[PDB]
Symmetry: C3
Subunit: 281 residues, 3 copies
């Protein structure tokens, strides 16, 4: 199933009939960082498997729902259970849910992820406001837009220089200052590692030389689809570890340690994003 105008329209039609919500904001939340979705008011949960043309996710299993409702008086749509390219989903499967968001009325997309720290100033538990990226899959002929262009959504050759909205970064930082946690908030450049293996010690050393501040396995595909169709983006990484220090000390990373950092910061991130949603222009 191609992520074209007709197929996205069929999915949006189903959603509109079932939910009655016309959302202005979309959210995609990282692993262990989804508690806000359970607090959406007057909400409606729609399993992906019920929506025409949504990608099949039963090989991976686990949760996969679209959730619509209100937060802070604002109408939102959330993806609960993200699709990642290391699972084998195609370009067309990643793009269709974002293009459905566009047809539903979404103008701003807020995204969180877990990532590894490269810059020496980053510690476990820090947040990074993403200001740009290095897209190794895109340089290497695996960009999410490889294929025919869907002209109704955007241009053949997008410019990504303003993909990460500067005013949204400034609002996120302002709110951190108001609540006295700005000491945890940095800005930086995100490297996309296709995955699913964590960056090796020598890959980490290379990324330091190349100007990367953080590295992870998600987010860049969604950012590119959103920028192509005119949706503004705020993307925030939660830092699980510093991969450069770990290489110098021969210390390992694993999914258990990552999820423990997520649990440590989940409630603060929930409060922060609730306020961002409330304050969006």
């Amino acid at each position: 199933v191609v992520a074209n105008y007709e197929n996205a329209s069929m999915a949006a039609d189903y959603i509109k009939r079932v939910s009655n919500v016309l959302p202005d904001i979309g959210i995609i939340c990282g692993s262990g960082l989804g508690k806000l979705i359970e607090e959406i008011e007057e909400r409606k949960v729609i399993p992906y498997i019920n929506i025409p043309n949504f990608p099949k996710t039963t090989v991976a299993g686990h949760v996969g729902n679209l959730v619509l409702g209100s937060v802070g008086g604002r109408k939102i749509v959330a993806m609960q259970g993200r699709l990642h390219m290391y699972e084998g989903y195609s370009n067309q499967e990643i793009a269709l849910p974002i293009r459905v968001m566009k047809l539903l009325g979404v103008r701003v997309l807020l995204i969180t992820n877990l990532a590894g720290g490269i810059n020496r100033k980053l510690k476990s538990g820090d947040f990074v406001l993403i200001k740009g990226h290095i897209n190794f899959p895109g340089l290497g002929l695996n960009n999410v837009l490889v294929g025919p262009n869907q002209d109704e959504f955007g241009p053949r050759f997008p410019d990504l220089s303003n993909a990460y909205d500067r005013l949204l970064q400034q609002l996120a930082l302002k709110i951190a200052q108001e609540n006295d946690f700005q000491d945890l908030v940095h800005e930086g450049v995100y490297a996309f590692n296709g995955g699913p293996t964590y960056e090796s010690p020598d890959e980490s050393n290379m990324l330091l030389k190349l100007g990367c501040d953080v590295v992870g396995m998600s987010t860049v595909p969604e950012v590119i689809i959103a920028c192509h169709c005119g949706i503004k983006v705020l993307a925030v990484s939660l830092i699980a570890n510093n991969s450069i220090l770990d290489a110098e000390n021969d210390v390992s990373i694993n999914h258990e340690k990552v999820l423990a950092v997520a649990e440590k910061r989940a409630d603060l991130l929930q409060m922060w994003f609730k306020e961002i949603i409330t304050r969006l222009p």
Copy 2:
């Protein structure tokens, strides 16, 4: 359809029956840089869709013809409407037209493209004679030669150290000097970005550190297929912008601006390549 000896032979047979031209030179021209094709003498236009085993191009649409005839007393074959890998064409679809050129008798391939400038000496409107490349798709398991080797055309493991003929570069520069436009002509290393998004500001900064002079989304696949089967290559980039300066000044690039640079230099490039064709050893 595999780009093998039998399938390439069937296409060449059709072409020979229809055109009567036995070409020694092939040309592939960049977007907005194809006016020379409309001036081929005693010419024959063959739509791709009519040629056995040529790749299907109707999803992308737009022009797609093989044009044969004479320029400067020399017999040539041109591709009008290039196939680019960001459109989703496979390795086999890119390679078949170049291998048909080989069977028709082509010994020299001349290629032009539009590209972004990385080296600080490059301005919009400059030309770069390509002397080597950095093939991000090839390092990342998307080389145009991934697949079984077609032994009739070339070896399993090609050496690319002489892919860009030095004497052809020297002839191109000599002709620029004769016509007093050598101040526009540089040499440099070309980075292949799979595309279709333009290099991001932070990707541009990385490429500067890695020794890249220019970056674009084409050319390297065709060069590799030509080198594999013993065809000599001259490749020239027309510079649309300097991506490093644009990053320092927060200035955007887009296809409209690219095509305007192409229109500004089209007539000079046409005159230059006509003389190169005439003077080839």
Copy 3:
């Protein structure tokens, strides 16, 4: 055919019925470096084409056998005829033979390859004990583990920081010292170039800047599958040339020259690996 638990089990069942050997050690040998396989004692040769669920290799042709028997009193299984990703084999085809080794009882995998030298200390004929890697395909969305995770074999997100066992490196060096050829033995970081074109002169210059000591077209996929399922690895590169010196002197590389270096070092490598097998803890 997916490299899952059921399919790997069917292949292992066939092998066990035919060979009667329960191996503790697996070996994968580079081109021209397979003489040790012909000296396995009380051996059994099983063509890949006869084993249920093994990948089809008839397009490439050439040899493809699993060989079981004894070396130095130890039970081993060897792959004779390696599968390389530049031939077009999928992730699932590369992984299945390694996962069969795991089900047969393999705890240690020994691997050899031919590679290009980047570090200025490396000459043709030198050996490099691999201590880490830079996986360009993995960064670029072509990691061997892209796809659903096979949970019976290992975790969704592997850590590769200890993929190259330190004690096995130390044993290999100890044996070189005992036989007075330690002057040929170095350690280093291996860059994976998907291939099949040799690294270009400008790619070589880039790899020097990025901290790479050697570059080749194999090994990293097998290492990752082995690490995922808990098999310890020793990987050794035989250096065919120094690509940085060749770029400075405009000298070419080719498969003939590579195979001549293999023939020059084959007997010494055979003796070294026989002793390593005998001495493994």
